[PDB]
Design a protein around this ligand. Structure first.
Ligand code: SRM
Ligand code: SF4
Ligand SMILES: [Cl-]
Ligand SMILES: [Cl-]
Ligand SMILES: [K+]
Length: 538
């Protein structure tokens, strides 16, 4: 690689970071959008206040404003549902480590409640909240209300650092390696500039996923993150080995690889900044399918990329990885659903199944009430789109198990439901080829009616090749497609994936059978479970 390739391609101008004029040739249309107007100005210069006053019909009449609502607003966590819910916006938070409070939960419920049939909420595969139904004129007031309850929505979509994922059992697990909350909190604060906005990291060539590992279970899926912090001692000090470049896309899926770098715990933020600066400065900004960080790592090689991170460190040093990390390879991933003792004697947590991650305002209020009455007002989200309520005195569990809402959000659903993960799908998402959430529940119910099993089989349903519900990690994965019935009629279908493994012995699954009509999946899945996962016909 020529030394010229290493010239930073962006420059700080008037508080924002912009592509230098010599590096603007051949860019994709998303880069053109960012050049035409800095997305962070919608928040940091209160551009949203004026935008929110313009009728959508008018907004749509010029490129600048249309790009504001369709692209730039994703820097404020607002996602126009142009195709499937025109003029309404999904809103996505920063929720490091999946931790929420009852007050935050009631606040979000109050927002969606206003929108009636256009409103609901969802837990995401990055243990995050999304709310739905938002109209533009309400945005200024929602931004205020979020701030008031201690939340931010900043930089949660498009070319930004996505939700910092941690251990759902952080601080409460007798077997934890290190509490991930301080680190995921610190990263989120760094990314969002303490909720004011951080333009130093908001003009990336592409999205970028971080996680901090604290569990032997690897609940955090470090193998599929752009940056994963693996806890490891080095020379008697606590810190993290660094894995880089994990990603999924329609074109390519790749597991994270070692940077061959270790940092002390206190250097979590400095090294996040260094990697992000390297990516921002040097990343390719052409074909959007070749813009994720791994593509830069392949072009420079890992050592060339590592050198780029090193020079952006303070003291310009980056220690080599420690030979062993703290994660035990001998580990059976633990079920967190149900009632489990905390490390704090006299206390339990409860994992509740949230069917396909979907909740209404009334459900949110009920979960908030349980957290206040039984817990400490805390609710934790998981990447399987479930919840954990921690800090329940164990003597209250008997009363808790009789709560009527636990029949809907169960601490002990059937085993196939425990592992079921499903993306938004075509109810709201404009990229979706099929309906996912309702369909996956129905198929799973019908499959479980036919077979009993003891293995915790994990089934993931995703509505298009963007694979937001990560079908490549599943025991059985279903990727939406259109296909044909026996009469050649168009029907919704799934490509069926097998071979995904999670935890330390991770592996990416691959298509096993293409184009299965969704109405034919039950018998296929019944047979797969009997033949490959030890299921027994009822
Ligand atoms: C909500 C969520 C799925 C879910 O039901 O849980 C989701 C939903 C969306 N994804 Fe995603 N992604 C979700 C996690 C993922 C992950 C999983 C993960 O992070 O571990 C992936 C694959 C992993 C990865 O990115 O490396 C992911 C891969 C994508 C892709 C393809 C990325 C690429 O390199 O090509 C896109 C399209 C894009 O970015 O260009 C996409 C685009 C989108 C959009 C914003 C598309 C569009 O605007 O409609 C979806 C919004 C639909 C909606 O209304 O909810 N989303 N998306 C997840 C929100 C996570 C969060 O809180 O931040
Ligand atoms: S996988 Fe496709 S359908 Fe599902 S939320 Fe992501 S972009 Fe939408
Ligand atoms: Cl996006
Ligand atoms: Cl759309
Ligand atoms: K779930």
């Amino acid at each position: 690689v020529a030394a010229e390739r290493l010239e930073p391609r962006v420059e700080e101008k008037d508080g924002y970071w912009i592509l230098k004029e010599q590096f603007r040739k051949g860019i994709n249309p998303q880069e053109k959008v960012k050049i035409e107007k800095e997305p962070m100005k919608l928040f940091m210069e209160n551009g949203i206040e004026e935008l929110a006053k313009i009728p959508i019909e008018e907004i749509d009449q010029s490129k600048l404003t249309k790009d504001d609502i369709d692209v730039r607003l994703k820097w404020l966590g607002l996602f126009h549902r142009r195709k499937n819910q025109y003029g309404r916006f999904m809103m996505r938070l920063k929720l490091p480590n999946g931790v929420t409070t009852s007050a935050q939960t009631r606040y979000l419920a109050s927002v969606i409640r206003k929108y009636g049939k256009e409103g609901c909420a969802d837990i995401t595969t990055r243990q995050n909240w999304q709310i739905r139904g938002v109209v533009l004129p309400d945005v200024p007031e929602i931004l205020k209300g979020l701030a008031e309850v201690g939340l931010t929505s900043l930089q949660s979509g498009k070319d930004n650092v996505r939700n910092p994922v941690g251990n759902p059992l952080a601080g409460i697990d007798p077997e934890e390696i290190v509490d991930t909350r301080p680190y995921t909190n610190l990263l989120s604060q760094f990314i969002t500039g303490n909720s004011r906005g951080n333009p130093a990291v908001s003009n990336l060539p592409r999205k970028w996923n971080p996680c901090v590992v604290g569990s032997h279970d690897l609940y955090e899926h470090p193998h599929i993150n752009d940056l994963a912090y693996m806890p490891a001692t080095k020379d008697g000090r606590f810190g993290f080995n660094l894995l880089v470049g994990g990603f999924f896309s329609a074109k390519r899926c790749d597991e994270a690889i070692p940077l061959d770098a270790w940092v002390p715990a206190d250097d979590v933020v400095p090294v996040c900044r260094a990697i992000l600066e390297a990516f921002r400065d040097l990343g390719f900004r052409g074909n959007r399918q070749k813009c994720r960080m791994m593509w830069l790592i392949d072009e420079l090689g890992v050592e060339g990329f590592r050198a780029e991170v090193e020079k952006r460190m303070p003291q310009q040093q980056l220690e080599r990885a420690s030979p062993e990390d703290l994660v035990q390879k001998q580990w059976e991933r633990r079920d967190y659903l149900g009632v489990h003792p905390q490390k704090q004697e006299g206390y339990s947590f409860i994992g509740l199944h949230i069917p396909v991650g979907r909740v209404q305002a009334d459900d949110m209020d009920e979960l908030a009430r349980l957290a206040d009455e039984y817990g400490s007002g805390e609710i934790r989200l998981t990447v399987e789109q479930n919840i954990i309520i921690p800090n329940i005195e164990t003597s209250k569990i008997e009363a808790l198990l009789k709560e009527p809402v636990l029949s809907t959000f169960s601490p002990d659903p059937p085993i196939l439901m425990k592992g079921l993960v499903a993306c938004t799908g075509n109810q709201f998402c404009g990229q979706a080829i099929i309906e996912t959430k309702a369909r996956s529940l129905k198929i799973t119910e019908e499959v479980q009616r036919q077979v009993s099993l003891t293995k915790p089989v994990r089934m993931h349903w995703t509505g298009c090749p963007n694979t937001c519900a990560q079908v490549q990690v599943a025991d059985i994965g279903f990727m939406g497609c259109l296909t044909r019935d026996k009469n050649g009629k168009t029907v919704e279908g799934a490509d069926v994936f097998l071979g995904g493994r999670i935890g330390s012995d991770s592996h990416l699954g691959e298509v096993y059978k293409k184009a299965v009509p969704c109405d034919d999946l039950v018998p296929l899945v019944v047979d797969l479970l009997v033949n490959n996962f030890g299921a027994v016909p009822r």
